[PDB]
Amino acid sequence: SFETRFEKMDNLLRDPKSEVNSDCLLDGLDALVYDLDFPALRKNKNIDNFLSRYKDTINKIRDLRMKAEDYEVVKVIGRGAFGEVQLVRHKSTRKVYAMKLLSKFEMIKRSDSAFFWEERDIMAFANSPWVVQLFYAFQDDRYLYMVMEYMPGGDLVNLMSNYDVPEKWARFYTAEVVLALDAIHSMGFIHRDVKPDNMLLDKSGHLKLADFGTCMKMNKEGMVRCDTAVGTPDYISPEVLKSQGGDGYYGRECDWWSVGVFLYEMLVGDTPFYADSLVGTYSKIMNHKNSLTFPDDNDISKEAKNLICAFLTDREVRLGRNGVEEIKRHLFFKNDQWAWETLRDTVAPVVPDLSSDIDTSNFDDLEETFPIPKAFVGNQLPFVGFTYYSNRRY
Amino acid sequence: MSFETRFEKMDNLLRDPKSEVNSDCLLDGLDALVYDLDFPALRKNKNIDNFLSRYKDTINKIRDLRMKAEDYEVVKVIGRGAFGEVQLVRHKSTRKVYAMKLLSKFEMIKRSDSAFFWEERDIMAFANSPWVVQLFYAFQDDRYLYMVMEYMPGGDLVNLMSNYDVPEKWARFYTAEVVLALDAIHSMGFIHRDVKPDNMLLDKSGHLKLADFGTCMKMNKEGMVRCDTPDYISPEVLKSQGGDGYYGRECDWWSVGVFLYEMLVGDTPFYADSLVGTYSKIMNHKNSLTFPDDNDISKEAKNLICAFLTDREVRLGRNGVEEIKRHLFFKNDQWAWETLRDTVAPVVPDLSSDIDTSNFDDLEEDKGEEETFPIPKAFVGNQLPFVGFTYYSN
Ligand SMILES: O=C(Cc1cccc(OCCCC2CCNCC2)c1)Nc1nc(-c2ccncc2)cs1
Ligand SMILES: O=C(Cc1cccc(OCCCC2CCNCC2)c1)Nc1nc(-c2ccncc2)cs1
């Protein structure tokens, strides 16, 4: 019909999950103008005339749309090779956020684009108290930006380094991780790299997962086919570690192995397969049946030992193969302080004591430009559609 | 300005029919990018290849849903040129009758003339004047630009002049309507530059509407224009064969003088057997303008023709429209300037149906395939000068 065709097209321009909504379309033109504005390419009159025709408009678009200079950077709270995380304050609204920057230069050098899409989607559409929320996502010729709610309580690496974690605390954090991973699993994703580094704490001391650079969408059978290993040397499961491509098929039960590693780390003070070298840590994971031991210190309960061992086994007999309820029913979680359904409403073991909205006390104290192209290379093309601003879900 | 003001201003820009970044122009941007990149040579670049694969399914849906040529049933070809053709069409769904002007993108690129259609698009789309042919929709594909307009069944002034020895009372009516029509264009900030009977169409009532605005240009701050067949063109526009000339709206008044002369004499005043000879006669208008010894032309009609067919510095219309309107030639008892389009026209067309083309000459057949652009080895951007041409009325 004539109206239908018009209405279907109109919904596409408005839909926050559409590849052709206003956000993606503005990204398309912004990328085209960046990728063409070079003296060598401007020798072509089609390119030159187009850029001149859109000059004034592109400057208005770039001024009106969300940009880095709208944010006042308070402190850098995270740093990696692919980018940095910074505590920012939006100059207009005066609102405090955490902003994750990802280097487009770094992503182009090495075939490592495409990882940020699931991190964008999980944070933008999870609508879960267990997942850090994405408020805005934007970009320029140099970086990808993700404006998120700030987690002032810091991460679990910081907590474990400042406290000898008692079992009652370890039960709380393990239980919240179990609920958090289950929310991710329900969305159809496998985390693949669950670690204390990506377990953040809010102003109340309750957990939220962040850093989803390894998340992969499950298939019909709830599986993932991956030829190359993904994760961290200490927390990687044997099945993800040995994945060759010819036989590299695995499910959500790989995230349950990581919980086992996390619980062990909290109660013992070290990872179970730790070695003086990375290659030795690999050897110990592969030989988990003989390398998993507990120190001769009665501090770890029978139930905590049982859970660690129930998780730190081959995927075919691992606790969680039959679902979350078999994990939830484990005697380790038996207590009189909380219940699974009301856990995030209870008072957390460590309630952060914060001086202001820009307090960074739980965070440790802390550019290569693209060469001028001679021909069209389209370095901005793999980032088209990243913007989450003009068409958001409310 | 606030964050909300910035967000809304951006939102209005995506919706505004006069905006260069509304949904129609942004969809054009992506459609052009996909056409210009989808070639085996360019697809060797992974940035280009991955982008096209990512937007494959989405672009096929967009192309199917958006307005296209196959939505229109071509009844008859009513106009033809080197740059394209005009055809009486019927929208297959709505069953509505329109005139559709097609412009060859290959011809526009080849001839290095691909920027003249903007003023024609804008005038017809936004004039909202009973003197300007209305643009209902404007769309495009990799081959043509399309302009879906209100059909003028009464034909043009070339057809009228060829079938009648125009009496002075009719010539007064058509000259007066042309004066009002050009004034509406002038008020919008445009100079026609090539006003001729070919441009002057008649509606179902026999009232004039201007069309074919391929020579139109937007006036500057001082109401001036600079630019780089001559029969109806003024000396100033002809003297500007390289940008060495600044002229105003008074060049359109000269053409009215040429039109009035043509109607009453039967020939253009500066006609010659060759184009170059017509040019020579226009430049020597002071000596070449003569009237035949047939006493038929009135003192007042001769005065107007001469008042218009002079050097721009002493031309009637240099001080505005009111000096033209007050000319004794227009003194009559049939109509008034303010109520002219409400009076009964000298020739009221007698039409058999909504698809009647009796006032349009039958054109010599032209059919087949090909006449397309070669496969590029590098990015050439042949679709770039046409981005933002799409327009849809509400
Ligand atoms: O993201 C990081 C750590 C980080 C820092 C800088 C760059 C990063 O990119 C590296 C990944 C690239 C991989 C992709 C797969 N292939 C291998 C390379 C990651 N930390 C976070 N902090 C928060 C947060 C949210 C609210 N409040 C506070 C902090 C949310 S995520
Ligand atoms: O446009 C034409 C005539 C025509 C036919 C075919 C192609 C044309 O393009 C050639 C000009 C391009 C030039 C520009 C300057 N640089 C050099 C290239 C023009 N006739 C019209 N008819 C209508 C109408 C509207 C309602 N009902 C019926 C007819 C409205 S415009």
- Residues with Cβ within 8 Å of residue B385, at least 6 apart in sequence: A46, A49, A50, A53, B108, B109, B114, B115
C-alpha distances (whole Å) from B80 to each of B100, B104, B311 are 12, 11, 34
Q: CB burial class (10 A; 0-12, 13-18, 19+) of residue B293? A: exposed
Whole-number Å distance between alpha carbons of A249 and A231: 15
Residues of B recognised as catalytic? 194
CATH 3.30.200.20 intervals, chain A: 1-154+354-394
Distance, in Å, from the CA atom of A151 to the CA atom of A96, rounded to the nearest integer, reads 11
Distance B218 CA to ligand 2 centre (A): 19
Residues in chain A: 394
d(CA B383, CA B33): 8
Indicate which ligand has the atom closest to the C-alpha of B123. 2
Contact between A263 and A307 under an 8 Å Cβ cutoff? The reply is yes
Q: Is B50 exposed, middle or buried (0-12, 13-18, 19+ CB in 10 A)?
A: middle
Tell me which residue in A44, A92, A113 faces B3 most closely, judged by beta carbons: A92
Say what angle helices B168-187 and B250-265 make with each other, to 10 degrees.
160
**Residue A86 exposed, middle or buried by CB count within 10 Å (0-12, 13-18, 19+):** buried
| Of A342, A272, A282, residue with least CA distance to A304 | A272
Ligand nearest to the CA of A155: 1
SS3 content of chain A, % helix, strand, coil (to 5): 40, 15, 45
- DSSP codes of every residue in B39-106: STTGGGSHHHHHHHHHTHHHHHHHHHHS--GGGEEEEEEEEE-SSEEEEEEEETTT--EEEEEEEEHH
* Other Cβ atoms within 10 Å of A236 Cβ, number: 25
Under 8 Å CB-to-CB from B287, ≥6 apart: which residues?
none
Please name the residue that has the structure tokens 């059978």: A221
Structure tokens at A110: 């090495």
Element (DSSP H or E) covering residue A9: helix A2-14
Nearest protein Cα to ligand 1, atom 9 = A82
End-to-end Cα distance, chain B: 31
Q: Which residue of chain A has the CA closest to B383?
A: A46
Q: Which amino acid is at A375?
A: A
Tokens 């025709």 map to which residue? A53
- Superfamily the domain A155-353 falls into: Transferase(Phosphotransferase) domain 1 (1.10.510.10)
B248 closest CA partner among B237, B239, B259: B237
Question: What is the rounded distance in angstroms from the CA atom of residue B276 to the CA atom of residue B230?
Answer: 9
| Crossing angle (nearest 10°) for helices A45-64 and B3-15 | 140
A49 contacts: CB under 8 Å, gap ≥ 6: B115, B384, B385
Contact status of B14 with chain A (Cβ, < 8 Å): yes
Q: Which residues of B touch A41 (CB under 8 A)?
A: 379
> Which residues, at least 6 apart from B355, have a Cβ–Cβ distance to it below 8 Å?
B75, B76, B88, B90, B97
Cα separation, B224 vs B247, whole angstroms: 5
Beta strand B84-91 with B97-104 is antiparallel
* B337 and B176 Cβ atoms separated by less than 8 Å: yes
Domain formed by B1-155+351-394, architecture: 2-Layer Sandwich (3.30)
Cα–Cα separations (whole angstroms), residue A315 to A214, A272, A283, B115 = 19, 17, 18, 66
Whether the CB of A184 sits within 6 Å of ligand 1: no
B107 annotated as ligand-binding: no
Q: Which among A8, A32, A379 has the least Cβ separation from residue B47? A: A379
A394 contact B CB<8A: no
CB atoms within 10 A of CB B2: 9
CB A328 within 8 A of CB A178: yes
Residues ≥6 apart with Cβ < 8 Å to A376: A35, A36, A41, B42, B45, B48, B378, B379
Q: Which helix (H) or strand (E) holds B19?
A: none
Nearest C-alpha neighbor of B186 from the set B209, B216, B211: B216
> What's the token pair of residue A286?
């592969």
Distances (CA, A) of A358 to A45, A131, A363, A365, B29: 51, 21, 11, 14, 41
Give me the amino acid identity at B294: D
Three-state secondary-structure class, residue A29: helix
**Contact at CB, B47 and A378, closer than 8 angstroms:** yes
Query: What amino acid is encoded at B276 in this protein?
Result: V
- Dump strand ranges (E) for A214-289: 216-217, 223-225, 249-251
Q: Does B29 touch chain A (CB under 8 A)?
A: yes
Asked how this structure was determined, the answer is X-ray
**Residue A349 sits at the chain B interface (C-beta within 8 Å):** no
Chain breaks in chain B (C to N over 2.5 A) after: 228
Resolution of the solved structure (Å): 2.8
CB-CB neighbors (< 8 A) of A36 in chain B: 381
Is B371 in contact with B106 (CB distance < 8 Å)? yes
Buried b (16+ CB within 10 A) or exposed e, A213-229: bbbbeeeeeeebebeeb
C-alpha–C-alpha distance, residues A243 and A224, integer Å: 11
- Using CA atoms, how far apart are residues A236 and A119, in angstroms rounded to an integer? 20
Question: CB neighbours of A45 closer than 8 A, spacing ≥ 6?
Answer: none
B300 carries a ligand binding annotation: no
| Cα–Cα dist A182/A176, whole Å | 10
Position of tokens 């000096």?
B323
Residues at the binding site of A for ATP are 77-85, 100
Helix axis angle, B3-15 to B23-37, nearest 10°: 70
What architecture is domain A1-154+354-394? 2-Layer Sandwich (3.30)
Q: Which two tokens stand for residue A193?
A: 């790299």
Token pair for A302: 């029978």
Domain range B156-350, its CATH number among 3.40.50.261, 1.20.1050.10, 1.10.510.10, 1.20.1560.10:
1.10.510.10
Q: Where in chain B is the domain with CATH 3.30.200.20?
A: 1-155+351-394
Chain A residues closer than 8 Å to B37 by CB: 378
Distance CA A378, CA B47 (A): 6
Q: Does B385 contact A at CB distance below 8 Å?
A: yes
